[model samples]
Target: SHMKMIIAIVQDQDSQELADQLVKNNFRATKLATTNTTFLCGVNDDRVDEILSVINQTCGNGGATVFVMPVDAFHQF
Candidate 1:
């Protein structure tokens, strides 16, 4: 199966529940804990996009952004 990665940089206030929701979607998310913004992170493997949408509605949108990067590092892993 082809692999893809998802990177989400969210506002700090929205990070925790975002992380939890990502986990429920079967991905392990890591939080950077940066002061400028927090995150609802979803990275590595084939992630469910709708999950992010759920997070958006649940936490409220417009404050955070999510992007998917095809990380080459995961190519070997």
Candidate 2:
């Protein structure tokens, strides 16, 4: 499958704007509230870079971590 999962851990200060930008770019993500904000999403391989770019731009030098992993399968329910 060409699907991949993205896990982004961003500082609380950048989380809200990042989330808005993701939505504006039509990327669906789920946010987990914690000491730092964490975002989760599954996307096609081709769009991995796009999403990363969004994260990079929005965070703007802020400390953030991202992981892209292949998805064996995904189910929505």
Candidate 3:
């Protein structure tokens, strides 16, 4: 399966709520707190749609910006 990265940028007010839903759905995400909060998660291609839906559900339609990119490599240490 292909791996990809999802970058979700949401308003500060919505960040915490969104984070909760993401965790509830078993998505491993990290937050970058800069008011306009950014969430980063890496997942398999199969989960892309689910993640996007989660973002949409949390933030509402057009309430956030999203980007999906192919992962060249992923490693944990």
Candidate 4:
């Protein structure tokens, strides 16, 4: 079970656009939607490397911080 996950903590305004671009780049965005709207979100495992590349390219200047991590399992039914 090998999967890569991208964890992002971006400025709130960047969240939606980032998510859109992520999906267009063939990744699914999982958003936390915080009350303070901290812009905490993630993209699931797929095209892990390039997807990250584009994030910085398309939405780089928003002062977003994103991390990539490998996951053990989804553990979902």
Top model by TM-score, which number? 2
lDDT of 1 by residue, 1-77 (tens): 34455556666676666666666767665665587354434343444466567567646554766666565544334
Cα deviation of 27, candidate 4, in Å: 1.0
Candidates sorted by TM-score, descending order?
Answer: 2, 3, 4, 1
TM-score of 2: 0.90
Q: Please write out the lDDT profile of model 4 over residues 1-77, one tens digit for every residue.
A: 35766776666666667767867766766676553133333345556667768767656576666677767766557
How do the predictions measure up, each by TM-score? 0.61, 0.90, 0.89, 0.67
Off by over 4 Å in 1: 38-48, 60-62, 72-77
If ranked by lDDT, best first, what sequence of candidates would result? 2, 3, 4, 1
Of candidates 4 and 1, the better by TM-score:
4
Residue 40 C-alpha lDDT in model 3: 91
Model 2 lDDT vs. the true structure? Answer: 0.89
Clashing pairs in 4: none
Across 1-77, the per-residue lDDT of candidate 3 in tens digits comes to 87899998888777878899989989999886675888899988999999999998889553799999999988889
Separately for all candidates shown, the number of backbone clashes (residues 3 or more apart, or on different chains) is 2, 0, 0, 0
